[PDB]
């Protein structure tokens, strides 16, 4: 498992729990935000979901580039007419970091349906660089959950996209998710997913590795639990639509357990 | 960052990289000499390039002796200056220099172990450099030696994704790359530190192909074309063909002539075939070939 670097997989792990704790937004900026709510913000990742979708983009793009999003909103003040276009340059930024194919800066000016220039778009680009100080390489609940991931026994498909899906779902409610590390947020999605699925919970091995218990991750996963509950009834349903495809399994289709038992 | 260019005074030209050119230039305030790497984004048509967030984002937090240093961004709306820790001289013009004479063990033996903590400390820090080369391997006055231009290096979760196929310069570039495998590792750039090794002692490289098909049949002229047993899995892979001719595995002694033991014994678990056998960066700096080390300065 050179693919899984067993010589420095647990110095990577450590290496991103500090590095999340630096990358972490501000919990509560949107109070302070006086233009824009939660509720924009829901749309706005809804709509990079789709858009990721349709360019095929990678997972870790679409939780890059809400992270890009979050910080930027965390220290600049912004107009709801130009929300959408921080989170344009956000997506592209975490593109070109992270895609093997980025597209091209006129593909982004095109799905914000000419409300934006492609020189609107590239001034953004660099502002969103300036603010946060290039600082780019950011721990994503995708990078916990993979190494999670490498835990089951066995492998189960179906677990491991229903867990992405869950993570997912989070990235839309900056409340209550912001107050919660995408580290704790995957051990969340994780053990739901694993619940749900195989009845099982929380590997002792993850405890060893993370050192989390469902003591420790029991708040989160409560909020973690109503928001699968209620997810069919969400006013943001791109994720779920997503998540019907046999490229995840259909795994949007299982049902939410009634209970947890935790 | 507390830079601005008034501060800086050209020197000269010392190179060209992927953006434009490098110069070498002195802080007219600290008296400190520098690199700087322009990104001349006016011809970007396309924002700022990939190349350069990548090289930024991930050298900003690579702060460890034997990777240089980027010490500042000037982010001027016309252009983009990356400001580096400058080193006076690139491991390939040294090879060059140090040619009729050869290097000398200890400063091979120094190198090679600079260059592996270095790169282990990149592999800790989740990332792939994919363009090691003595090229891209700066050397200063006091001995030190360090990995530069990470304008090809990748950020990599774990397990690995599928990241770009078009990585390493080809003499230096890993079988599993050239055989089309849908992931990559650590190990490539193992295997290119391998060349590399090599490489400083011979003065010439290992595997000097012209095309991907040359490249490897070279590899496998030297180190016996790989079947099922040494490598599990490579009859099965996208550019595997079973007409590919079956040269024998030739005694390592025979490969790099000059080297003791201990040097043929880490050059082979830097060249394994498979790479979930390849050497770590971190394992080999516990190699016995390392006992003795010290860190002289460059001899010339
Ligand atoms: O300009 C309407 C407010 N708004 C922007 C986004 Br993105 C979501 N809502
Ligand atoms: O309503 C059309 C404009 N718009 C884009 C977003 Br995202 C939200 N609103
Ligand atoms: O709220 C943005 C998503 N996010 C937070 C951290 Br720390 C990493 N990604
Ligand atoms: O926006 C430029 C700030 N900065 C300094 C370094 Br080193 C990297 N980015
Ligand atoms: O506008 C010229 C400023 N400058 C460029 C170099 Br190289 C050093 N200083
Ligand atoms: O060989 C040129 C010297 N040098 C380049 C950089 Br980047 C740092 N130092
Ligand atoms: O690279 C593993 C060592 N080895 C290769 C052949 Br062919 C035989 N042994």
């Known amino acids: 498992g050179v693919n899984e670097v067993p010589d420095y997989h647990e110095d990577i792990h450590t290496y991103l729990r500090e590095m999340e704790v630096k990358c972490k937004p501000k919990v509560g900026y949107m109070k302070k935000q006086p233009d824009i709510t939660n509720s924009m913000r829901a749309i706005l990742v809804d709509w990079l979901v789709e858009v990721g979708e349709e360019y095929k983009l990678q997972n870790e793009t679409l939780h890059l580039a809400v992270n890009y999003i979050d910080r930027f909103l965390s220290s600049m003040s912004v107009l709801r007419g130009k929300l959408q276009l921080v989170g344009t340059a956000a997506m592209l930024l975490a593109s070109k970091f992270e895609e093997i194919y980025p597209p091209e800066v006129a593909e982004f000016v095109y799905i914000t349906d000419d409300t934006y220039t492609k020189k609107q778009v590239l001034r953004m680009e660099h502002l969103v660089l300036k603010v946060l100080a290039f600082d780019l390489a950011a721990p994503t609940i995708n990078q916990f959950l993979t190494q999670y991931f490498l835990h089951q026994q066995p492998a189960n498909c179906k677990v491991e996209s229903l867990a992405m899906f869950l993570g997912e779902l989070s990235l839309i409610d900056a409340d209550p998710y912001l107050k919660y590390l995408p580290s704790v947020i995957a051990a969340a999605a994780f053990h739901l997913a694993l619940y749900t699925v195989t009845g099982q919970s929380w590997p002792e091995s993850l405890v060893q590795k993370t050192g989390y218990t469902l003591e420790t991750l029991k708040p989160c996963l409560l909020d973690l639990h109503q928001t699968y509950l209620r997810a069919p009834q969400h006013a943001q349903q791109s994720i779920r639509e997503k998540y019907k495809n046999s490229k995840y399994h259909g795994v949007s289709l299982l049902n939410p357990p009634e209970t947890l038992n935790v | 960052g507390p830079g601005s260019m008034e501060n800086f005074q050209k020197v000269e030209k010392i190179g060209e990289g992927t953006y434009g050119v490098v110069y070498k230039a002195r802080n007219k305030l600290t008296g400190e000499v520098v690199a700087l790497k322009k990104i001349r984004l006016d011809t970007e048509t396309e924002g700022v390039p990939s190349t350069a967030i990548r090289e930024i984002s991930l050298l900003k937090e690579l702060n460890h002796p034997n990777i240089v240093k980027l010490l500042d961004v000037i982010h001027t709306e016309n252009k983009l200056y990356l400001v580096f820790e400058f080193l006076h001289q690139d491991l390939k013009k040294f090879m060059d220099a140090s040619a009729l004479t050869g290097i000398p063990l200890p400063l091979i033996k120094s190198y090679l172990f600079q260059l592996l903590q270095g790169l282990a400390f990149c592999h800790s820090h989740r990332v792939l450099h994919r363009d090691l080369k003595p090229q891209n391997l700066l050397i200063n006055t006091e001995g030190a030696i360090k990995l530069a231009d990470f304008g090809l290096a990748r950020a990599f979760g774990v397990p690995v994704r599928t990241y770009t196929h078009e990585v390493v310069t080809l003499w230096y570039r890993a079988p599993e790359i050239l055989l089309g495998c849908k992931y990559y590792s650590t190990a490539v750039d193992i295997w290119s530190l391998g060349c590399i090794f090599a490489e400083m002692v011979?003065?010439?490289?290992?595997?000097?192909?012209?095309?991907?098909?040359?490249?490897?049949?070279?590899?496998?002229?030297?180190?016996?074309?790989?079947?099922?047993?040494?490598?599990?899995?490579?009859?099965?892979?996208?550019?595997?063909?079973?007409?590919?001719?079956?040269?024998?595995?030739?005694?390592?002694?025979?490969?790099?002539?000059?080297?003791?033991?201990?040097?043929?014994?880490?050059?082979?678990?830097?060249?394994?075939?498979?790479?979930?056998?390849?050497?770590?960066?971190?394992?080999?700096?516990?190699?016995?070939?390392?006992?003795?080390?010290?860190?002289?300065?460059?001899?010339?």
Do not use: C
């Open chain 2, 202 to 300: 011979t003065r010439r490289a290992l595997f000097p192909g012209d095309s991907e098909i040359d490249q490897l049949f070279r590899i496998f002229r030297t180190l016996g074309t790989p079947d099922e047993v040494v490598w599990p899995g490579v009859t099965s892979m996208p550019d595997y063909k079973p007409s590919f001719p079956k040269w024998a595995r030739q005694d390592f002694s025979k490969v790099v002539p000059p080297l003791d033991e201990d040097g043929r014994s880490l050059l082979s678990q830097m060249l394994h075939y498979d790479p979930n056998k390849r050497i770590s960066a971190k394992a080999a700096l516990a190699h016995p070939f390392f006992q003795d080390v010290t860190k002289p300065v460059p001899h010339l």
